[PDB]
Write a protein that binds this ligand. Structure first.
Ligand SMILES: C=C1[C@@H](O)[C@H](O[C@H]2O[C@H](COC)[C@]34O[C@H](O[C@@H]3[C@@H]2O)[C@](C)([C@@H]2CO2)O4)C2=C(C(C)C)CC[C@]2(C)C[C@H]2[C@H]1CC[C@]2(O)COC
Ligand SMILES: C=C1[C@@H](O)[C@H](O[C@H]2O[C@H](COC)[C@]34O[C@H](O[C@@H]3[C@@H]2O)[C@](C)([C@@H]2CO2)O4)C2=C(C(C)C)CC[C@]2(C)C[C@H]2[C@H]1CC[C@]2(O)COC
Ligand SMILES: [Mg+2]
Ligand SMILES: [Mg+2]
Lengths: 6, 225, 225, 6
């Protein structure tokens, strides 16, 4: 579902 | 103060305790106190700082999205009022981080790894402000995010290898900025793609952080194509 | 104030929003503001209140246990200092709940369900104080917990059916009090056992809350025997 | 591991 960031 | 009476090393020690206890607001207060000692952060200490605030803002953003969702569907004043409360709190945290970046950290960061690290953070916290912005300053918030990210990209490209976890995480988040903040899915896609490919070709010089992030890039590419 | 200017129904509405957003401290502040309107709480509203503070204190107790663990194993001052910070914060929340119970809630609670509910809460928050107590007042904290729980047991036995979720949850927690606070594993075991058996024999008059709690009783019995 | 309360 939700795009990744870091 | 509130942290000015505590020893620098005691702040770092308590930040690591707070992390173990999942007390991320305490964690962030302790790290903020550390930065305020005026000395530059080590690698480990910058990591602690970013993780503390990343968690605090992450809870606030998750809550903001729930309330914004509820609000749009309800479209009395209570939903909007409470969303506004959370929002203003979220902005205050982003201003605190940006204030720490602008006052101490970016200024004194001479090495490549530190400068890029702080410029990525600056991009991220303007990006979080941009997620909630709807005013006249929206546009200026977006270009502050882009500007920080761009400077971080330029340095990282000159000074760091393609597989550096900081380079990879920068590109991952800059690519998200393109996709959902700047409305440029194509640029988001090209940046994720190219970053992932240059990184594959340099694995021959490493690793867990980097493969973790490359997976995050693969995930977004799979999501977006 | 801080909640005195907001409408009672707006507080309850925002508490339910805060719950959906997992903002349990906001939740608890809103419910505290509701109680401070001076009117008695409905069933739903008492449920919201208990869930708000139960969550706040639950995070603080989980963190306290991590720090106490670390402290005992390390046996400088930093671990003890930070454990003390969390502890004092935890005590302040328990005092806030106990203050709300003593000022508004127990006093005006005429029906069985409300009185038992508030007396269980009073037992729980003294129990949480007893988990951290090591002073001269430890003993007095333990008997405040026991005394509240006992009065709640007496009413619930006269006035409520054995399968009432409030009766069952009371017994579950009173049994935990016996086991780990009062050092009376046998009494903890007999109380869990008898509660579970009387409840089985009354299922013929119901249900999700009650079977949930009966499972929690089965879990503790399995853990303790 | 940890006893239940409610
Ligand atoms: C600097 C790195 C990575 O090197 C860094 O990882 C170091 O730090 C984390 C947390 O340290 C507080 C780490 O410590 C251990 O080793 C890990 C790493 O070396 C471990 C527990 C282990 C692995 O489980 O997690 C990080 C993560 C990686 C997991 C990808 C996620 C949190 C972060 C700090 C964020 C930042 C990433 C890219 C840019 C970043 O996003 C910052 O932007 C400013
Ligand atoms: C009053 C009851 C139960 O009736 C009560 O359940 C009502 O309220 C909860 C939460 O409401 C804010 C509930 O709402 C929905 O229906 C459920 C129930 O009727 C639901 C989402 C549904 C089920 O998913 O969870 C509760 C739980 C039960 C789940 C066991 C756990 C939280 C609590 C309030 C706590 C209290 C228990 C026993 C004494 C208690 O421990 C209080 O001591 C003072
Ligand atoms: Mg400063
Ligand atoms: Mg009061």
């Amino acid at each position: 579902k939700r795009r990744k960031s870091v | 103060g509130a942290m000015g009476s505590m020893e620098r090393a005691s702040l770092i020690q308590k930040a690591k305790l707070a992390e173990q206890a999942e007390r991320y607001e305490d964690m962030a207060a302790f790290m903020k106190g550390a930065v305020e000692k005026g000395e530059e952060l080590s690698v480990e200490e910058r990591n602690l700082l970013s993780v503390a605030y990343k968690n605090v803002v992450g809870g606030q953003r998750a809550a903001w999205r729930v309330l914004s969702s509820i609000e749009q569907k309800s479209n009395g004043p209570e939903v909007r009022e409470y969303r506004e409360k959370v929002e203003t709190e979220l902005q205050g945290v982003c201003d605190t981080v940006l204030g720490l970046l602008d006052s101490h950290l970016i200024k004194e960061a001479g090495d490549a790894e530190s400068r890029v690290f702080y410029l990525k953070m600056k991009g991220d916290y303007y990006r979080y402000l941009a997620e909630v912005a709807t005013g006249d300053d929206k546009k200026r918030i977006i270009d502050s995010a882009r500007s920080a990210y761009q400077e971080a990209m330029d340095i990282s490209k000159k000074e760091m290898p393609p597989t550096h976890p900081i380079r990879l995480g920068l590109a991952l988040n800059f690519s998200v900025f393109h996709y959902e903040i700047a409305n440029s899915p194509e640029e988001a896609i090209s940046l994720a793609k190219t970053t992932f490919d240059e990184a594959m070709a340099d694995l021959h010089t490493l690793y867990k952080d980097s493969t973790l992030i490359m997976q995050l890039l693969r995930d977004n590419l799979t999501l977006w194509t």
